[PDB]
Amino acid sequence: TDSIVKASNWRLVEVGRVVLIKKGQSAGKLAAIVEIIDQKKVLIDGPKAGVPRQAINLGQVVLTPLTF
Amino acid sequence: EVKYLYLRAVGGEVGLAPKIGPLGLSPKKVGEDIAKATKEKGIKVTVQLKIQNRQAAASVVPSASSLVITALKEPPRDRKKDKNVKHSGNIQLDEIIEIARQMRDKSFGRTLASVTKEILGTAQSVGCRVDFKNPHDIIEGINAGEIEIP
Amino acid sequence: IIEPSLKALASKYNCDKSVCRKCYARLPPRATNCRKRKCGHTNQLRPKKKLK
Amino acid sequence: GIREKKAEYFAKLREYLEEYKSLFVVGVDNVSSQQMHEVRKELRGRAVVLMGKNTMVRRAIRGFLSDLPDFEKLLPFVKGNVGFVFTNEPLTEIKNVIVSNRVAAGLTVVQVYDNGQVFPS
């Protein structure tokens, strides 16, 4: 019998969270959060998947449960 | 033998002692005349630290620096008739307010004679204490006789 | 005879209040804006007046 | 003159550190103006009592790492309602004057510092 505070395991943004781009010219590719600018924008680059380094919104991309 | 300590106060010659000394085995009317032998110089308002021990009124005099500065002032008044303030500004006593104030039990936590000589020499609000100057602005220039009393 | 140790407590609950100027509303004695919205949350306050 | 008063505090703390060698940190809490006045009058010969802001003492020691760094062993002991006693008498007489005199029913000595080291005394 302990503290049963449960989880709410979100997936967090961080430096190196890998993300899935869905809207735009890249359209469903993997890239990584290089450095998060502010509350809604991140900075990504997916150089093996081809997508260039760009500031991008957090509406155009979705967090994936993988990190590095 | 017991211990009784009271603080008698300002009186002209023989000027409510009964309410403060009834429980100490002492008199009321004879105790009013017992304080006349100390505050009779000394015609300025001061206090008297009376120490009665269980069978007699033995009043002593507390050394007061403001009354010592009032003892270096003008005494002229008798009783109840000066009609304005019964106050008097008087002589300087540039060195007499430095020996008597530094001998009144060394109050205020002084570490010098220019300390007590300014504490009880610049608090003058009834006298002038100078021939060509005034009090309360001589503390920064009183730097003489500090090594003599200490 | 309310034995004023008690009467200070009743005056904590009834006397030591401030009163708004515009809306006459009872307030905490150290407030700075009246809590009501009909006076506009104004900052014009006065003490509740003591007896005599 | 808050800049002036604080620079004066820096200057006098630099003065009283580099003039005395016997430090007595005292655990003086809630002490009255009557007890302290008879401490100011009694210690006119050897000891210098110095109260004040112990967290202004924090930066005062932060800036004094360069000159005599052996005073680095004091900021964990400046915690608590403590004050400074500056003298040259090493252990006995100052500790006997502070603790024993003027007690009624806090005047102790919590730290003793002599030339770099600490002593229980």
Partner: protein, 191 residues
Amino acid sequence: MKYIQTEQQIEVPEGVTVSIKSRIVKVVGPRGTLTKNLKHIDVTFTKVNNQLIKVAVHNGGRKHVAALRTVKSLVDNMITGVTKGYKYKMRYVYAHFPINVNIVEKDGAKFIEVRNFLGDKKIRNVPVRDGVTIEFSTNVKDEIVLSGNSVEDVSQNAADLQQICRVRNKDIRKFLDGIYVSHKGFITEDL
């Protein structure tokens, strides 16, 4: 400015265990159990260890942060209520008519009956809420003591007992009669 995360740390003593599923909060310990429904507040609990629980609000405004700190105070109030308790010493204040207070049981509700307030003929009755008990103190005249576990129950029943005796159509600052909350402490006599 949209604070990026604010947090608080609830300390948990030995004898209590908490249980937070989504926002129902159960706290069980040496005096009983307390439950509080906090679905209306949108905060995030995280056990860092058995004795410390960090609540946190991510990306909140201003009012949202105020909600965070008052969540901390609510959980702490349940925890100190189920370890220690609460005990409000209310005391009668009467001018000429001695206020008479009893406890009656009617339909199993346990009302507090207020008689002869200001010399009235109206019998007042206050329902005692569940979780609060009422005693009358030894060797202190004209005192009532309301002790329970919840803050809300004890305090709201104390306010019910105070404000059922408001004085109508008189100068309230002359007629000071009533039953007023004097002391707001804990049941455990050591503290």
